[PDB]
């Protein structure tokens, strides 16, 4: 668990590409799991 900008949420998948998927948090190609995300704007920061 972590926080990101709203546009980055689309990168959290097996085989995705982008700055977060390259340099911060990457899944394996055979991932077995769930990805959950929400617009926590009230954290703003």
């Amino acid at each position: 668990s972590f926080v990101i900008r709203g546009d980055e949420v689309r990168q959290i998948a097996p085989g995705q590409t982008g700055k977060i998927a390259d340099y911060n948090y990457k899944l394996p190609d055979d991932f077995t799991g769930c990805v959950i995300a929400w617009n926590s704007n009230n954290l703003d920061n």
């Binding site: 998948a13 097996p14 085989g15 995705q16 590409t17 190609d29």
Partner: protein
């Protein structure tokens, strides 16, 4: 023309091997029949389907 029985063995062997190599050029519905195109043009989750 007498040796047609033996010449047919040579022709059938050649015809079958040429057909097996020709079939490398076919797409089979993939975006290209050249494997390095697919690997260089697509991200892995798309490339594996092709």
């Amino acid at each position: 023309s007498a040796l047609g029985k033996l010449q047919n063995v040579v022709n059938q062997n050649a015809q079958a091997l040429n057909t097996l190599v020709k079939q490398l050029s076919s797409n089979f519905g993939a975006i290209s029949s050249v494997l390095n195109d697919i690997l260089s043009r697509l991200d892995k989750v798309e490339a594996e389907v092709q």
